[PDB]
């Protein structure tokens, strides 16, 4: 997963996270595996939206992707009855992921070293070996 539960419980108040999680567990006591599973599902969502033009086991993780995983995990964790703002922000992050997949916006870099994640060649052409090109310094 892109973001750990210790970050989702920091961006979103831990008490509200416990309130959301405690029903979903089998026993009925605050649990941590539910949040990790939701974060894994959100990371899978982002991975699917990024694999279009990136090598998906990201060499360097864009620093905004932690936020983009936390928001989607929060929406996935409020599926029974979400606030209007939660839905609006989830639609905004889906729009951002669609723009990233299309090519309108790059995901960003790692804020530590400003390195952008690599990916496979979106465009690739092959032609026959070049003959009579200007690089052939013979003749002329």
């Amino acid at each position: 997963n892109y973001a750990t539960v210790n970050d989702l419980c920091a961006r979103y108040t831990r008490t509200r996270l416990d309130i959301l999680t405690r029903p979903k567990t089998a026993d009925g006591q605050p649990d941590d595996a539910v949040a990790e599973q939701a974060l894994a599902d959100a990371s899978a969502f982002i991975d699917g939206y990024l694999a279009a033009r990136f090598v998906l086991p990201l060499t360097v993780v864009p620093s905004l992707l932690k936020r983009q995983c936390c928001v989607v995990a929060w929406f996935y964790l409020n599926e029974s009855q979400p606030t209007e703002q939660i839905t609006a922000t989830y639609r905004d992050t889906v729009r951002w992921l669609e723009q990233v997949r299309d090519g309108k916006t790059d995901p960003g870099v790692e804020s530590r070293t400003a390195a952008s994640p690599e990916g496979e060649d979106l465009v690739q052409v092959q032609s026959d070996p070049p003959v009579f090109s200007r690089k052939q310094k013979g003749f002329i």
Partner: protein
Amino acid sequence: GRILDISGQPFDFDDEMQSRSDELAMVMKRTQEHPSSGVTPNRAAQMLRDAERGDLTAQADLAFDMEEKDTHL
């Protein structure tokens, strides 16, 4: 023995060839430049001007390449 040339200057005639004088062994053996590879009119003018000033090497190599390359020529 002091044979005079056409201009009437006496000298001594030697049977040894001038190139085979044991002093011009490293200047009579030159590997050709082939300057006609990627010629630009600026560079052709430069070699022509160098030949005009006196250094005829580049002009001669260029002429040789023109003779062997351009079939109609």
